[PDB]
Amino acid sequence: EDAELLVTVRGGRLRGIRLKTPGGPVSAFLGIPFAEPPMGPRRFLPPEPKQPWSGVVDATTFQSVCYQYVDTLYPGFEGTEMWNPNRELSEDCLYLNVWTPYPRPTSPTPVLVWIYGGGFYSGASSLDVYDGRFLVQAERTVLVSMNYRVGAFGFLALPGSREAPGNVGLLDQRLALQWVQENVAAFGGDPTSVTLFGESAGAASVGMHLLSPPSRGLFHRAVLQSGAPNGPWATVGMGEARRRATQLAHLVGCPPGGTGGNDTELVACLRTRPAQVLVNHEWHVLPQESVFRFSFVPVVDGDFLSDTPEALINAGDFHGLQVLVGVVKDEGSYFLVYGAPGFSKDNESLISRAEFLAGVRVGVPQVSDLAAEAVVLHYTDWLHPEDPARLREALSDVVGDHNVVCPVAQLAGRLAAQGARVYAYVFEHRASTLSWPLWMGVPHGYEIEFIFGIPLDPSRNYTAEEKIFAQRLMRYWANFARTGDPNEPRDPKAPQWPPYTAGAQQYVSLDLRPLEVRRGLRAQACAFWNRFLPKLLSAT
Amino acid sequence: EDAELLVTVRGGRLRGIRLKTPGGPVSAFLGIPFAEPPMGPRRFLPPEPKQPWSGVVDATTFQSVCYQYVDTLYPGFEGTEMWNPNRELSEDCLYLNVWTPYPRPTSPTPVLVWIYGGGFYSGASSLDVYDGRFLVQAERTVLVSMNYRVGAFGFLALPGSREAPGNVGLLDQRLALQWVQENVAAFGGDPTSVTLFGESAGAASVGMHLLSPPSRGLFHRAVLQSGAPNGPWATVGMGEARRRATQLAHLVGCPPGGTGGNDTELVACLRTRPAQVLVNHEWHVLPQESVFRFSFVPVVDGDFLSDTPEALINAGDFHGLQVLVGVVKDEGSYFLVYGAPGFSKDNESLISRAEFLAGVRVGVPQVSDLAAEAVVLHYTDWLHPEDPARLREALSDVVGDHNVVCPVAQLAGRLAAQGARVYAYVFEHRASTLSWPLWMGVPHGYEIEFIFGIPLDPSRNYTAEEKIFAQRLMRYWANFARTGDPNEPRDPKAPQWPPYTAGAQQYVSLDLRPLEVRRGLRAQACAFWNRFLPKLLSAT
């Protein structure tokens, strides 16, 4: 066997598996049940801890993916299907994974906890791009990742009722963090040095745990990659969440006409429907034709979030907190092929002036015609108002700034100015093996493979420079997980990474070149979104 | 006895004077009466042609300056005194001047006609900086300049009535243009090649003559320096012009206590007041505290201007017309010492953030608080939002773009796209003898001394490069007056001046260095004023 592939946790015994890397082996415990399967009468309900089990639970392979929509925009395409489920779908999906170095650390080791993205409607901890064997081997860290319910199963909310309170997907993540506090020591991990890190919707989830008191005590550092809780997509109002849950119920025949109405009968009817039936009508509850908008997201209910994320961020005291935030160079390009007219991954997407004006309404839905004109003014080069190439990158900036860059910059500034230690970055390396078209540049989500050391995989065709670049990034993330500072603790050889402040607004660029310090995360563009445009929407 | 100093015109005989230049003599005829003195019952009335005279009218010195306010912001300061009247004030001021080379041209010579600026409240053709002896000697053209009524005497308007119809100051300029058609041949000038050029309010006057059919037939080319007829200061509505005229009457005691206040009784009472009394209350009729706003300006009445200047520019056909437009580098800095808080010509004017916010309301009066927010958003460097130096240059840009640069670019683009050949420039050389503080850069109005060849005056302390630079500009202006093209017709050696088009938007920089082609007259900033802000005011 291996003596270290057998571990006892509070619920029972487990048997892991050894993973091979070019640098050495790693012990992995994949598919650990941390919650009772949220099935039958437990659909839409908060999770319960997994009851203890007899015998040895097999933890040698990833468990099922939570029921979710499957992307079909480009069948057979690597760029889209790398995010699709790689295990079979099931509501029995509340399982987590633990990577630990070999040999097992004898002293408490800092813990990294991954939260996958996917717009709160998709994602899985089993994706190949989340393989934590290279990050754990190269940095001797303990890596944990969990599955959480997405879509209606995780975020359908009838606010007020007990049958569908909403945010149960966030509670799934919290329970996995409580499991980490109670069991990560058995794997050699320090429960007093837990660093959350996630991307997109996962980064937004990490931010909502900062703003939730019960979750705040379960971790000590946070990393938010291309996402923030205060974005225009990460939360939804109580009234709007009720309308979508009612609309989804209507699309699946709930309630049976004309018997029913209240929330008890509505959720009871939803529980009888097969899981695939609810998924098949998920996108048909959104209010508009739009991109970067998702049907079932965290709801501002007063429970998990006592107020809106914007309100909690402004009134928050973040002393004793270290945050690492950042974005990719082209946040909006990935989302333009999902609705913006004239865009296609198979041509160069040289859109016309008319298509640009139409795409602004898709990228910025629910804004007055005056608000859209303010967006057109700010993102139009008036020396070349018709140039298709410039218009293509302009709409990409519109979607990326409105949804990612400016929500992140507003959070990074408020955190630093209110006690938190903040480090900011911009990822500017396009992978040599990237399958998306060249005009997308560095799309959203394609820094993850370098954070997890995927270039080190010998079965892949990365360059030698990308392998060294991946190791330097893993050093940054691990140093931040250990010390709270991505700079190497005793090393001025490489240039330093200065903290991000509300005044200087310093960040570093992450590419093959050495670190380069810059100032302002699109300060002029984000002043339009964060300062002026709210005033324009107030006076309709 | 020099027979060249004796000329007969349609009204009688004149005796001129010989003026000395380092390059040769020039025959000047200063103080030619072109209208009956608009005194007594003729105050506020359109001009009437000067009745023919017997004898020899002496034309050896400048005549009286029209009654106007005298600047007292900095007593004894060269930068302000140079614009103050240098002759006695009088309502008998409708006189013009003619410069002609020696010996007198035997072939019909193109004619330049100068229209001074001064916010329609001041100015005079007798100012030292308007001396035409150097431009006429170096380029052998015929230069004409006239006095026109300013302030209430030229632009007080009770629209509809016949006693104070308004725009009589513009009619003074037109009458002088009719005089050029009927008499410039006697001086060797060609009435079929007349080029207008004016600065600030003079440039706005040149623009309004283009938009007036009776004036359009009196000339063939136009030059507009740091001014346009479509600016927010060059015109006023009928209702506002009536309110200002009525309050001026009130401030001087018109009508008397217990007197009917119709237009006839109001003007009759105004005609009894000494001219200085009306001047002493001119600035007390502006609606609010502001800079770059003037009490009595051309009124949009349907007579001289059938519609607003912007409406006439949009619907205008300008085929067969050549226009030379341009601005100085720092159009707004000179006006900031006239009301903007924290500004002083005797310190660095390092204003605070609060003073910048207050100055925007002074530089942009009568705009909603939301409109002011949009101005601050566009002109704030959000990476250095409190830097006093940057805020100083920002408010200078706010005033310069809102009042000069963007009204000119709007005009230049519409002219080129609707039949006119347009040339654009930016004057970027700061005179070595400039008395204004260094932080004003190249202030508004300080390209005039180089256009008129003032550096060639031996009693001045200009540099050798400024003398060559002044000759370049006189050649540019003369080439445009002769051929409609500032480029040298016999030369491919020098850098060429490409026409300004609505698409490429090419202009040249005018300084000691050779010509440099650039694109866009502050295109991003002017799209805010010309495109977005009108949408913001319509939605309030």
Ligand SMILES: NC(=O)c1cc[n+](CCCn2ccnc2/C=N/O)cc1
């Ligand atoms: N069933 C459909 O016709 C359908 C429409 C839109 N979507 C949205 C695709 C996901 N998306 C939206 C904006 N950006 C994205 C990409 N996420 O990875 C999915 C399905």
Ligand SMILES: NC(=O)c1cc[n+](CCCn2ccnc2/C=N/O)cc1
């Ligand atoms: N008597 C006064 O208090 C008074 C107020 C304003 N002014 C206007 C000054 C001229 N001005 C104002 C803004 N821009 C200008 C242009 N100066 O050339 C003069 C006097």
